Amino acid sequence: EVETFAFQAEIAQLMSLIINTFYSNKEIFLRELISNSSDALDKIRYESLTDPSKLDSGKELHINLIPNKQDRTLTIVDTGIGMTKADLINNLGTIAKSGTKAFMEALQAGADISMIGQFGVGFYSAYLVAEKVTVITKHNDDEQYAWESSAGGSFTVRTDTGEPMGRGTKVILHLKEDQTEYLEERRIKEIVKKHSQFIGYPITLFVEK
Numbered sequence: 001e002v003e004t005f006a007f008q009a010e011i012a013q014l015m016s017l018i019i020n021t022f023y024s025n026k027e028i029f030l031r032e033l034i035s036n037s038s039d040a041l042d043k044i045r046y047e048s049l050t051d052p053s054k055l056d057s058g059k060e061l062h063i064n065l066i067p068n069k070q071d072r073t074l075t076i077v078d079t080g081i082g083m084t085k086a087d088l089i090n091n092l093g094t095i096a097k098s099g100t101k102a103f104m105e106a107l108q109a110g111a112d113i114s115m116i117g118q119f120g121v122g123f124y125s126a127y128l129v130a131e132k133v134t135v136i137t138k139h140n141d142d143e144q145y146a147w148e149s150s151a152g153g154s155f156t157v158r159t160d161t162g163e164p165m166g167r168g169t170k171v172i173l174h175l176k177e178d179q180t181e182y183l184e185e186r187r188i189k190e191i192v193k194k195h196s197q198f199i200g201y202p203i204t205l206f207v208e209k
């Protein structure tokens with residue numbers, strides 16, 4: 001049972017801008033997704049300080065980066081707070097309408113795309129490198145869901161019958177054909193070292209057979 005939703009017009013406009021603007025410094029997508037994972041992990045950590053049962057779904061707080069060259073996917077897994085179905089529908093838990101407004105003003109006032117995270121909409125930087133993004137998530141107060149979009153103005157939400165996650169979020173980037181450098185170990189290591197060196201959770205880069 002799959003539900004299809006239209007993006008709000010402002011978010012569709014954000015996504016078109018990210019997809020269509022010539023901008024070479026695409027590697028910042030990974031900084032932005034790791035930062036989102038860190039923010040999610042901070043939220044479940046804070047809730048656990050007064051209610052340790054919040055971690056019954058998983059005590060470890062970490063980020064895994066999983067490249068798969070056969071499927072052409074880079075997956076960012078975290079064990080943070082996750083998202084409810086309502087959060088997924090409401091722009092993946094962001095204030096994306098107001099964030100887009102400010103970001104588009106800033107781009108016209110000199111800013112560049114790399115600044116997207118200062119506007120709370122860094123998730124959408126995934127579309128610098130992905131033709132399709134799938135988000136699998138599990139929040140303590142809801143069931144496991146899959147969100148997906150290839151842009152084009154719509155996204156889907158369905159219950160996920162895949163491997164249960166416990167708690168957290170998995171962002172699966174189905175990379176564009178010309179963006180496969182982001183599956184190479186040396187390139188991922190370089191980006192994490194350059195942009196994510198002060199993230200306070202372990203970031204494990206998985207290797208491939």
Ligand SMILES: O=C(c1ccccc1)N1CCOCC1
Nearest residue numbers: 017021023107111112113114
């Ligand atoms: O920062 C930029 C930017 C674009 C062109 C020239 C200088 C900067 N952007 C990223 C891509 O989307 C638009 C905003």
